[PDB]
Design a protein around this ligand. Structure first.
Ligand SMILES: [Mg+2]
Ligand SMILES: [Mg+2]
Ligand SMILES: [Mn+2]
Length: 224
């Protein structure tokens, strides 16, 4: 179907090749971003690899973004720092130490937020665990991913792309709770994966930013 009612820069990105995985995060093929995000294809079992970054500054504030109205899935939605997909190329397919996803994150942090690659090298990105989830944006578009959860603690310089991001802000624990109450009462919108992680893992990790190890689980894929 017909992507003419949609933003041109976003549409171009639909040609990007994502990693098709089985339910255990083993690579099984490669498919365009567009096909990976059609509900019709997700209903046929299509599942791709993804990542979510949560970036805290040195005041321990979480950087949140609001997705531009240009985004094809979940526009206008408040969400964690940066999400995307590792590309089906040899740089980002690399599975040794989840290096391919961490490289993908660094790349998207630069593309979405204008964060210089040097400010967040792949070593500064802490891969915690993975979550499997399925969620619809509308009738046509949706998500089905095993999402790599990445944490960064870094003071960064921002110049975000207005095509990707409507607004952004750093929040304290209490300010996010306040924001999550506005979401629950329909005053703003949040993405389904951010709701999932906020309800389940986020505040536990947040309380323990110095000791993130007890949370590192590279074996278990959490099913939400
Ligand atoms: Mg994104
Ligand atoms: Mg290797
Ligand atoms: Mn996706």
């Amino acid at each position: 179907i017909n992507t003419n009612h949609l933003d041109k820069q976003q549409v171009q990105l639909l040609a990007e090749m994502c990693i098709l995985i089985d339910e255990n995060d083993n690579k099984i093929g490669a498919e365009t971003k567009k096909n990976c995000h059609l509900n019709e294809n997700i209903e046929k079992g299509l599942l791709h690899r993804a990542f979510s970054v949560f970036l805290f500054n040195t005041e321990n504030k979480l950087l949140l973004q609001q997705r531009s109205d240009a985004k094809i899935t979940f526009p206008g939605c408040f969400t964690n720092t940066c999400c995307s997909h590792p590309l089906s190329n040899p740089a980002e397919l690399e599975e040794s130490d989840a290096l391919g996803v961490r490289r993908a994150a660094q790349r998207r942090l630069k593309a979405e937020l204008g964060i210089p690659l040097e400010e967040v090298p792949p070593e500064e990105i802490n891969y915690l665990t993975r979550i499997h989830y399925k969620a619809q944006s509308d009738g046509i578009w949706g998500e089905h991913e095993i999402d790599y959860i990445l944490l960064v603690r870094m003071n960064v310089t921002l110049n975000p792309d207005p095509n990707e991001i409507k607004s952004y802000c750093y929040v304290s624990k209490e300010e996010l709770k306040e924001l999550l109450k506005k979401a629950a009462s329909g005053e703003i919108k949040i993405t389904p994966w951010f709701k999932i992680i906020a309800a389940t893992f986020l505040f536990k990790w947040w309380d323990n930013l110095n000791h993130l190890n007890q949370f590192v689980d590279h074996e278990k894929i959490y099913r939400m």
